[model samples]
Target: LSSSLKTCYKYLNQTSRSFAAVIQALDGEMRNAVCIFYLVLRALDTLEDDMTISVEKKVPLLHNFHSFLYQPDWRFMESKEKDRQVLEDFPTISLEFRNLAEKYQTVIADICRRMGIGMAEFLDKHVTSEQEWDKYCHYVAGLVGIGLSRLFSASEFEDPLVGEDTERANSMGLFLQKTNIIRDYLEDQQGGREFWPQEVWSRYVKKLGDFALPENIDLAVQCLNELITNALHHIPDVITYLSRLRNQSVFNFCAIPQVMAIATLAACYNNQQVFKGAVLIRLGQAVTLMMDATNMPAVKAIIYQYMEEIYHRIPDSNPSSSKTRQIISTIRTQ
Candidate 1:
């Protein structure tokens, strides 16, 4: 690795350590390609996540972020977000991005551009409908799935068929993104941002944050269950997506997160702690998943195990229990 590439990987370690291993495990040049892909999107996410930056300033940057990759001299040194080094040392990141093969570079660039546009589109709006939720997820994360598949195919490390079916690829991303949105509910709200779709949460409380009240804990959990159920519907799709992988590195990169998502969903399902505080899957549980989810059968077993854990927790009294049970059973068919 060049000094610049080494430094970029180091930044990857610090900013997104959990992802570093799977990314580094990628085969051939795809490893650096995916690393740069992640760093670019992460840098874009940092801009959107920082509330201290006003919409007037943030929107333009979000829309222009992908273009900044080619500009060479573009870097924002003033972001208050903790992961601001990507923004501050963006030239290094972009330099590596430009150094990639044209095919890999364009795939990353296109996804980055589309995600930036999607991020900018929602700055002034709220996710008011479930469709909006899906669209929003598509913009922020679905594109990540689509891009990674594109990268995989472009590297010739995986079949082109993996990139062809975007619908299943999208589920791969929405599953993780929704799990995060659910787990980070309290954290997002504390930062004055609310991602819980109004259409879903409004059925429980007049305000999104209101569900966290002690008096509202019951409804909050019910609401949380409903969200988890929505996430549950994607598990089978995740399995299908992973089933297409022929490369061990690609499989591990794709499978580990799906396993982690299932575990996270199990921990959050019907749990009031999500509304009251941040929910984290146990560290030991995460290590187990990372180690155990190395192959398809193991991943399938891991997912089924977590799905059953969620299945038994579903209260017949809870509003989403029936749907939750149905999705859980559907996951079993996988």
Candidate 2:
């Protein structure tokens, strides 16, 4: 059942370490479709996050994204979104994404509808603060978590959203995304933007987070660390949720991302490079890290060691990022 969607995933599978690990574990069909969905989402996110593009230009791209599914003989814009080095590498995506869009029209529509509406509303408002942007993240990305959870349930994986313990599975999606928001603070700030939580930003400075100012370093680092902690809190819940998957493919797919998220969270905590600038772990390092973590004992030590290191490095990190923490936690417990 693995459809043309695998072609799309072949490109996206490399961009996100956590998602790539999970996608690796899924069976052919589920892997392909979910990967395509993720690819679509990532593309839209790239457009939105590009600080260089004017909001006027970016908002129109999203509205047009929904239209792509229905056009006869449709093709993505021969623009930068496709022409970039990273985008051009998709092994065989163009034809596959086109085919899958036709094959899964209904499912694709449902997902796009949610994204378009959420995105439109967010861009319509002015976002001047980090807290304001977190809500924006929820609209674009948090909804993705909810959407994926629902789709996983309907697929061969049997992810029932109604399950009593299924809360973590749902929250894991948002957890991965929020951590990304935290990690990207420096990059976004470089774009003349700031998504640092205001309360947290205020702790170390009288002025707001100034990406250009050297003095903002401590607050920026502390804020980023707090974001990682919030994202990690969802891990146990994800494990509980993932372990119950009856499908080996699904279980592995989900487990890989969750573990990767744990690793990513750990790396972001004490790593000065993350706050110094936008940093993605190189593919070679990922291969080596996951390879070195071949055994359970090794895996546990790696995750725990990183988590502990994060806690130690920022001994003064605060709980202000906790608002999102509770928002995500509420997804499962309440």
Candidate 3:
């Protein structure tokens, strides 16, 4: 690897705290490719996340982020995001990006371009309806799932079948994405960001922020369960995606977050802490899964265990009882 490439991986480690480990475990050039890909996306996310940037100045940069990487002179020093080095030293990252094989370049460029435009559109719109919820998740997360699968196939570590299944690839991305959003109610609320779609939350409360109030605790967990049920629908597809993985590092990369997703879903199930505070899977459980989830059967068992936890937590009187129960039953049966 070139000195510049090593620097890019440094940025990767700096930006993606949890992801760098699995990424470092990847085989051959795929590791470098994914590292560069992660940096590119992280920079784009910083652009969108910087609240100080006016919409007028920010929208065009996002739309053109794909093309801008090739400009050589591109760098933004004004970004306030903590990982702003990726943006400030954009030329360093883009240098390595340009040197990657065209196959890798093509996949990264396409996904980066599409994600940029998608981010801009959502910036201008609200995730109001359930369909819009799916659409928004698809843009931010599902596209990421599809992009990574394409990267896997391009490296020839796995079959093309893994990349070709868009819907399932989407599910792989959506499950984790939805779970993260679901578990961040109070955090996002405090930041004045609302990722939850209005349609789902409005049924339980007049405003989405109402869930943070202790007075609304019952409705909070009820709404949380409904979203949990929606998230579980994607787990079957996650199973399908993981089953397709042939390489150990790739499998580990894909499966770990998935197992964490289920564990978190279980932790957050009927737990009012999602609204009142942060919700996280226990560290010991996470450490155990990290060591054991490398195999499909163990990951499956962990998933099943968490699914059952959610199942037992569902009260008969809960508003989402039937739907949540049915989703769990379907996941359990399959």
The RMSD of every model to the true structure, in order and in angstroms, is: 2.1, 6.0, 1.9
lDDT of 2 by residue, 63-157 (tens): 77656555545443333543232334332443455655343445555666667766766664545465565566666765665555555665645
When summed lDDT is taken over every stretch of 10 residues in candidate 2, the lowest stretch is 82-91
lDDT of 1 at 235: 83
TM-score of each predicted structure versus truth: 0.96, 0.69, 0.96
Better lDDT candidate (2, 3): 3
Checking candidate 2 for backbone clashes, the offending pairs are 2-29, 22-253, 153-159
Task: By lDDT, rank the candidates, best first.
Answer: 1, 3, 2
Clashing pairs in 1: none
Question: Per-residue lDDT tens digits of candidate 3, residues 1-334?
Answer: 5998889988988998687999999998788888998999899988998889888888898999999778888999998879999999999999999998999999999998999888889886777887888888887888988999999999999789888888999888888888999988877887888888898899889988999889989988888888888999898888878887898989998998898888898899999778767776764345345558888887887787788788887899888889988887887888
Error of 3 at 115 (Å): 0.8
Candidate 2: stretches off by over 4 Å = 1-25, 50-61, 75-78, 81-104, 124-134, 159-170, 206-212, 270-272, 278-306, 312-334
| Superposition TM-score, candidate 3 onto the true structure | 0.96
User: Local distance difference test, per candidate?
Assistant: 0.88, 0.57, 0.87
Off by over 4 Å in 3: 283-291
Q: Comparing 2 and 3 by TM-score, which wins?
A: 3
